[PDB]
Swiss-Prot record, chains A, B:
This is Dihydrofolate reductase. The strain K12 sequence is shown. Strain B [RT500] is resistant to 500 micrograms per milliliter of trimethoprim. It comes from the Bacteria. GO terms for cellular component: cytosol. Changing E154K: In strain: B[MB1428]. Changing M42Y: Increases catalytic rate almost 2-fold. Increases catalytic rate about 7-fold. Keywords: Antibiotic resistance, Methotrexate resistance, NADP, One-carbon metabolism, Oxidoreductase, Trimethoprim resistance. InterPro entries: DHFR, DHFR-like_dom_sf, DHFR_CS, DHFR_dom. The gene is folA. Changing M92F: No effect. Increases catalytic rate about 7-fold. Its EC number is 1.5.1.3. It comes from Escherichia coli (strain K12). Changing M20L: Increases catalytic rate 2.5-fold. Increases catalytic rate about 7-fold.
Amino acid sequence: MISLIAALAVDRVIGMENAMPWNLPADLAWFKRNTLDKPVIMGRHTWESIGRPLPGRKNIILSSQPGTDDRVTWVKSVDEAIAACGDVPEIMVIGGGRVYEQFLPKAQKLYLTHIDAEVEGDTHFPDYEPDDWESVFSEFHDADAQNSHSYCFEILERR
Amino acid sequence: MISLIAALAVDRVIGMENAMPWNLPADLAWFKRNTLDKPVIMGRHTWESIGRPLPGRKNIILSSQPGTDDRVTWVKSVDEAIAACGDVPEIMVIGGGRVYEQFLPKAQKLYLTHIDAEVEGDTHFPDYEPDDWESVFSEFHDADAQNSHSYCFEILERR
Ligand SMILES: Nc1nc(=O)c2c([nH]1)NC[C@H](CCc1ccc(C(=O)N[C@@H](CCC(=O)O)C(=O)O)cc1)C2
Ligand SMILES: [Ca+2]
Ligand SMILES: [Cl-]
Ligand SMILES: [Cl-]
């Protein structure tokens, strides 16, 4: 099945012109825990942002342009991206906006990090219908010595 | 000689306990490049913020309470902290607020990172009369895909 994993600020802001104004090592630890050993599909902008390939995961870049790196798999279509994952139980889609939009309809589960930050965004997470999803796990945390803002983990399953 | 290194948001606000709302990896690289191979002195909250001994540096913690960990040197007073550094060219003071206050009088250099972020905070870096200090280096950088805000590195020398 396919899942989407994303961090959302208030109003579902997922991206800014520049780097997000928060420091959440615990959020990154949750993203790792939930994507390790799984294939991850991402757009080119998200890739360039990352820096390098995510260790221990098969990195798949969905883009219309030519691949610039031989350490990862470049695909031109959603179907292409999926086939490239092969036979696995779960496929994680990691953004950004456009990629999330394109895969939401096929998605069965959402792993979200709601962050308490009010920011002006460039891109937002597609709108999802709360009536259509079931919250199966939620966990609130306040900001602390290593995390700049308060955040909440949530996992939802399609009804 | 003694130097203090700090990251200041608008109005000289500095962290108190929770991590600051920004993400500036270029600033941590500057931090590292300037403290490596030198003794660093810090207070107890800074120490929780960091979360482990900084590698390649002699870690000195000034605090009135118990020395939890064995990997660093724990002192109860300024003089005690200084002594622990031994005979070296530069001692780096890394905060927090009170620690900065205690060492400023003795400081000969300041390494500051001015960040273009409006943050509500209780603490402020000690007021330094810019006239007793000579600004010897200043370099501005805009925010980008990896750094959430604009920042400006600056070195001041006490005259
Ligand atoms: N320039 C500057 N920026 C800051 O944010 C601070 C200061 N100074 N001085 C005080 C305090 C320091 C907090 C602080 C210091 C180091 C690391 C750290 O992880 N240091 C590594 C760098 C690792 C890296 O580049 O990720 C290091 O080895 O210095 C984190 C927090 C905060
Ligand atoms: Ca439930
Ligand atoms: Cl993208
Ligand atoms: Cl402190």
